[PDB]
């Protein structure tokens, strides 16, 4: 009865939703995320899974601030306004 | 509820006796504002809200 009959008792949850990485990998009793390692300060990553590294590496998300940096470098991190521009 | 009744007073000069709230399955909040018996909700909806 280790198969189909035993599968009828599966109604608990080992993992819940993790606040940091969004996956259903937060161990409800250990309070430790299996994927990102929350609540440790560092994000969990290993070199034996380059697939897992590239699933979450920089550039796979939105780059909400980092994508604007190369243009600012190209213009030299200048401040101010163009000469004769309208404004205050 | 306090923010809803203050907003109603500031926008439409509406005085309410009580307000019930529920968060709908689509995620927005719905508020049932019962007005004072002095004013008419039908008249308010006809003039200000334009719901006829």
């Amino acid at each position: 009865t280790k198969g189909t009959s035993s599968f009828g008792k599966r109604h608990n949850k080992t993992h819940g939703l993790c606040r940091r990485c969004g996956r259903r990998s937060l161990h409800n009793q250990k309070k430790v995320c299996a994927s990102c390692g929350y609540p440790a300060a560092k994000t969990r990553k290993y070199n034996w899974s380059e697939k897992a590294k590239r699933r979450k590496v920089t550039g796979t998300g939105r780059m909400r601030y980092l994508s604007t940096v190369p243009r600012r470098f190209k213009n030299g991190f200048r401040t101010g306004v163009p000469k004769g521009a309208r404004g205050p | 509820k306090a923010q809803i009744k203050q907003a109603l007073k500031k926008l439409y000069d509406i005085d309410t006796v009580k307000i019930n709230t529920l968060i709908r399955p689509d995620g927005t909040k719905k508020a049932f504002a019962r007005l004072t018996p002095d004013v008419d909700a039908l008249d308010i909806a006809a003039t200000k809200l334009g719901l006829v």
């Binding site: 939703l17 259903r24 | 968060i23 399955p25 689509d26 995620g27």
Partner: protein, 50 residues
Amino acid sequence: PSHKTFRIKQKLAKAQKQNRPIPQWIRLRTGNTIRYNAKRRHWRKTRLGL
């Protein structure tokens, strides 16, 4: 269940709003390659995984 957290209900709200077929004007656009909703969810087929 009827007992649910606000976070869980918010994710269910997002799933409920996403559960639709594509608008019919999408297929009439110039160079349209979208024919149907390929991420459509049903309550019997694929679990939300929450």
